[PDB]
């Protein structure tokens, strides 16, 4: 008999990783049944080295938390569901650069705007505000203008949406006197009451970022698991 | 099943700014019906086309 | 929670925004908010984030750096604590709404230099 | 087994090798089991050693199967 | 992953290796069988012989193939399902070797089990309709409870999950720790066949608090096959939890 | 579509023209759609049309599905009256005439409605009791008779109503003692047997167990309403005589089937309750039984709301 | 008719056995599966177990509370009656209204009641005036 | 608004002849025709059945059914007129409405069906025009031969 | 035995 | 565990 | 592709009662038989191929001994045979023998019998091999100018299917069919030309409709139905066009054809959400339900009122 299959399974069960690696390198392992067994026993890291199929490789790379291999497989597959799952796993590992790329590829503009806010990238957040304007997403455009503290764009959005009363209130409350006067001329003085401005109104300015997050979350070089270090060489 | 949790990035509908006559663009029901009848409609929900 | 977060954020009640994100299970976003606006809270949020991530992927949870253990991986964090106290002392009172045209937009402000 | 179990012997490794009317099969103490080889004739396993299954046929002839 | 539905049919020591991808559709079962020649010999007339047990009918007999040395081929076979019964598919791979007097002309495949659960849907009826159907149904299968589960509610939830049957007995009638529980279950097949079950279980107080649940499950149906297949499924599910 | 529902509400009377189709499934879908479009503006016109259709089903005996259509109309009128309680006063008298129908299923749906209405709408109790006393003698089905007895037993609140119930029960039993009357009849000293005496002679004693419960409820209530001890004791003894004569009949060879031991135990319990007249038994029969109905009806309404809420959630 | 007779026997003789709990499962399962007559007999049997066996009383009270939710009027009224009598925890009430039937002659009772209804007095009818069976 | 197929089926549910007017796979049309006899409700006063994907419109013809398979959004008024036209074409070629006569005349029926529907759209044809088109009697051909 | 009989008694 | 029930109820149901 | 994945235009489930004719018997009957024996042999060959039998040995026998026959029944049966017979090698290359068949199609497109031309044009709508269509294009174009409306209507359908599948063979097809539509008098030819323009060039279909929009009420019901289909598709793609067509669709609610009324009411609901438009469409549906005696119509038109109520 060829005992290779059950010896491999028994070496894995007994955590004899040296014997498993020696069998993987030197034993004739036939078919994908052993790869399926490695995955099912919680060793997707070992299975990943033997899979060429990009869909299976992507799934195993996500289970391993190997974002680099998952990124290569996701680029080859170019599927929206692959990008969404890669984004979730990359976020859990603090890799905000891959999360940014996944949200760009999935066109998830609201999550991308929130990511730029929490990372302190105000320049990219201002690009997201322009993208919302081009898409005619008035709600997203106003939300991005709130994140930036841009009262002038908020007044412009309210004016374009026909909300004259709110546009005047916003402009006059925030000291945009030229825009407030221009809006005031559009009120019919016989029929429309001009809103009184609260002189005690406070500026709701977003806090400034102290330390913007340009680099990914620093990962400790955890000792590459016995399998990753030995197979790669 | 229709009450999707409104996300922070979801569009704000300003009913005062929408023209009263915007019929929601229904999908072309004739073309969908023909594709369904031919069996070429991938069932939307169950077969994740990326499965 | 979307309206609650926006309403706390517009008041500068960053601690309430942070607790809302923690309570909703948005621990990564809470850590990003803490690092950007509340650098004093980062270590607390990272501990909660490690504990929650450890239930799903124990290796990924161990890979997250805590600034209390690895200060060298968080350049400028010590300076950010001094800036956080400065922002709390200098911006304690909301400005009158009529002064909006005189307020520099947050995009042009380098709070670390100020 | 749907098919009648005939005989078995323990291997030196702690695997139980058994015969049905149609197959030589193995069973491990963990419950894993499988087919090793088809049998043209029902055989009675006496001993297993390495790659050799010592058996008696229905004519009481000793046979060795690889 | 297609991998979760891959079933190995032969061993690596067989002259022909085979594995099957089993795809169960609503009315048909597609078997995609990979066949690999592990020998240096050309296998002539390599034929997948399938036989079915239960209300399964093979639609087309697989055609014979010729496999070169170390060559491989896929053989598709379609099996039609006519009723809600437990099916078993048996098979052999038969081949002729050119010129070698090899005593081996047949590799016996592993049995493929078809699960009745793919055909059973949870259904609702009134207690009056349940009692009427329970009196009227001709076939009863009495299953004896044999589980390692010690909680009555966990055992009921396990039976509900393993049978796809709906519990008709209200949660208030199941509430409280008394060591006794009775529940009525109802399901319908995709073919419109009604299946009823009564679960009558107890905790044997005299064996202590760690005693396994004991009792009977009675299944009633109009068809013999439905009652038999559900009973066999419950017996199989109870044995898997005893490991 | 909630935006289109209001436009369809104005067309409900045109949708009801589809009821001219003899097909039962078309009528069922039309009635369901009309019931779903019912509003405060159209309920009165709808109820008038549905009443006219119910009356037409009595005159048109010829269609096989007429009884099923009648049952559908009754259920539709029930659901309208539950949603719009102001219509219940107009619907109940017409529906209660169907308690005398040969179609047990339609009469059962009416009886369930009347039971719910009399519990929810205190202002309708008098009207329902008065109408129930008028139709009581015309009831042909044992199940409907049992349900009518229970309603009369639970909701009769006046001294005149309690005496009227006792008079109709005596009329439905015939001459008492029953065994002596039947022996005299056989000695010569469908024979139009009063309906209750017919049911008892056919061996349906479960009606007698329900009658014993009804007689116990009304006798205990009569004792509370009447101050004259001699009248109280006479009425209690009369109720006990009716139970005793039924027990004697049920143990005799006269009925087609003997009384069950469970029905004997239930009637014997009611006799014992009336002999002791304890305040605990009076609270159980006259308060707790009505509270149990109210809790059952509220529980059903909560489960329907929870099921709708689980579908909406 | 056979089911009700067996339930009545179980209610009388079951509580007197060494292990009365064994029968309660079978009796209670009738309340869930059976017709109104058999359900009524099952409730009466459960009440007899609760009246004779103090150890079973708390379990029987919970079972009777479930039987009060029965759709049948006579089953519900019996369950309500037995629940309220057993909740009083008085052995004299249990013996009087659950365990012990009438001890009087039925023909004697009928004849005495017939005489009393012909000549009704201000004194209530006394059951002790009737000859014992 | 598309007629997918026209089929003549036995009351036992065997399709004898089917003509498809749109690009359908053999497996799809055979599946749809095999489902039809199980979907047919008896005792109803209407002659259509809807599935999730297709509508069957049928007319009983003694021992046979004339069946049209249409999309759910097909115009039922046009489909019923089309069904009546198909049902009138069968007796023009088949004297008895039996499986054997339909099988003998299967090609004549296919040729007549192709005159009624093109690319899933109904042609404006009557029974006399269908007869004229299937006879193929051309005056130009007679002149050319002469 | 009588308890098993009442489980399927038609009488 | 398969048993054919031959109760009066099952006979009356089969006869109905 | 397996026969099961192939496009199937014809299903014939004849019980093969008699001994299935041997390929040698069929070959002898096709070669030496009279016209009747050849016709029956060809029918049997078609039924065998439809039932999944592969008869590649008969292809050249049919080409040599059956294809040159002038019998009308054999000509029609040959079109069904060419619909189902494999034309390509397993590697997707056209069979060399098909060049001989292409010349026969060209001769049949030039045949003096108008019904042979029309039937051949209808068959060409099912052809997927561009290499077979390319040498036929001049003969197909010449069939548009044929004196018989039967040839012209089928020539439009052939051009439409060729343009849809193989645009490079006839890139001028939308223009050619527009000029045909303007000059055509036959109602079936006009409908088929207009139907092609709806799918190939909606702008040219709209230009034609704009010239005739005031006369649409006077058109035949078949042309009115296809005009309603265009209006639906155009207004669905471009909501700004709705304002132009509402008046035309409202006039079609008064059509004498109940089929046109139904489609016009359905289209009107998609053009306008105004209460008056919905009321007019709903009244048209109610009037159809009351006037139409067929329960199939009543039930399906009732479902349209239920769909309207969901809004």
Author numbering:
A (entry chain E): 592 to 824
B (entry chain K): 660 to 710
C (entry chain G): 725 to 838
D (entry chain D): 526 to 591
E (entry chain H): 711 to 953
F (entry chain I): 311 to 499, 536 to 659
G (entry chain N): 450 to 582
H (entry chain L): 1 to 146
In the authors' words:
The positions of densities for the COPI components and Arf1 within the assembled coat are very similar to the previous model; however, there is a clear additional density that corresponds to GOLPH3 adjacent to the membrane, positioned between ζ-COP and the N-terminal β-propeller of α-COP. In our structure of GOLPH3 incorporated into COPI-coated vesicles, the C-terminal domain of GOLPH3 is positioned in close proximity to the membrane, oriented such that the hydrophobic hairpin is inserted into the lipid bilayer. The residues that comprise the proposed PI4P binding site (R90, R171, N172, and R174) are located close to the membrane interface, which would allow PI4P binding. GOLPH3 is located between the N-terminal β-propeller of α-COP and ζ-COP, with most of the interaction interface provided by α-COP. For the interface between GOLPH3 and α-COP, residues T189, K191, and T200 in the hydrophobic hairpin of GOLPH3 are positioned against the α-COP β-propeller in the vicinity of residues N135, H136, and Y137. In particular, K179 in GOLPH3 seems well-positioned to interact with residue D94 in α-COP, while E183 may interact with R55 in α-COP. In our structure, GOLPH3 binds over and occludes the binding pocket for K(x)Kxx motifs. In each prediction of the COPI-GOLPH3 leaf structure that we performed, AlphaFold 3 predicted that residues 11 to 13 (LVQ) in GOLPH3 interact with residues W849-K852 of β-COP to continue the β sheet in the β-COP appendage domain of β-COP. GOLPH3 is known to form homodimers in solution through its hydrophobic hairpin, but when assembled in the COPI coat, GOLPH3 is monomeric with the hairpin buried in the bilayer. GOLPH3 is tilted to form a wedge-shaped chamber above the bilayer that is closed at one end by contacts with the bilayer through PI4P and the hydrophobic hairpin.
